[PDB]
């Protein structure tokens, strides 16, 4: 069976790789899709790439977004999706 | 190395394991919260691998308010929405 924690880890790895990818040179669109779907912007583990996404308009316009930028970041949202608490 | 095609196949399977337990298991509260969070999150109700369970999914109040058999026939299913997420559409 697919295990919850395993798939969560895989998806946060996937997201982290698109964030890294979007900063250079499909990654921008995957990053924007994650941010808009999960209502987050970046990762507490990747502060510089998060600065890049805010500087490049790759985050959703919610002041709720900014107030929970790192308090409820895309790793937490991915965990919440797989836990049924998003 | 990240494998997007494996990850999307694994997400679709996770969803179908939750949906199947949600309909048969009366106290699977985590499975029902997983399916309801996928449906609210991705704007979908049911999957193409489980077309015959949509009736049941609806009756168990697992889809967002508004969903019903007719409206749901004119929407993409959850697998397609999972694929849209990993391809940067959604």
Residue of A nearest to B5 (CA): A14
Gapped junctions in chain A, after residues (C–N > 2.5 Å): 25
For residues A80 and B79, give the distance between their C-alpha atoms in angstroms, rounded to a whole number: 19
For residues B37 and B62, give the distance between their C-alpha atoms in angstroms, rounded to a whole number: 9
* Burial class of residue A75 in the structure, from the number of CB atoms within 10 Å of its CB (0-12 exposed, 13-18 middle, 19+ buried): buried
Q: Using alpha carbons, select from A53, A51, A40, A52 the residue that is nearest to residue A12.
A: A40
Opening angle at CA B73, ends B70 and B75, nearest 5: 120
Option in A11, A27, A80 nearest B7 (CB)? A11
Q: CB of A8 within 8 A of CB of A78?
A: yes
Domain boundaries, chain B: 1-90
Question: What DSSP string runs through B48-63?
Answer: GGGGGGHHHHHHTT-S
Residues of B in contact with A84 (CB under 8 A): 30-37
3-state DSSP assignment of residue A69: coil
The CATH classification of domain B1-90, taken from the options 3.20.20.80, 1.10.599.10, 3.40.50.720, 1.10.1450.10: 1.10.1450.10
- CATH code: domain A1-86 is 1.10.1450.10
3-state DSSP assignment of residue A28: helix
State how far the alpha carbon of B81 is from the alpha carbons of A9, A55, B43, B76, in Å.
20, 28, 8, 7
Structure tokens at A37: 């779907």
For residues A15 and A20, give the distance between their C-alpha atoms in angstroms, rounded to a whole number: 9
Resolution of this structure in Å: 1.6
Q: CB of A49 within 8 A of CB of A15?
A: no
Q: Using alpha carbons, select from A56, A83, A84, A46 the residue that is nearest to residue A69.
A: A46
State how far the alpha carbon of B63 is from the alpha carbons of A8, A30, B44, in Å.
23, 26, 8
């Amino acid at each position: 069976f697919v295990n919850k924690d395993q798939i969560a880890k895989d998806v946060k790895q996937f997201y982290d790789q698109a964030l890294q990818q979007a900063v250079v040179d499909n990654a921008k669109a995957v990053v924007k899709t994650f941010h808009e779907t999960l209502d987050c912007c970046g990762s507490s583990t990747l502060t510089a790439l998060t600065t890049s996404v805010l500087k490049n308009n790759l985050c959703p316009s919610g002041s709720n977004i900014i107030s929970n930028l790192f308090k409820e970041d895309c790793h937490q949202k991915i965990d919440d999706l797989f836990s049924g608490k998003h």
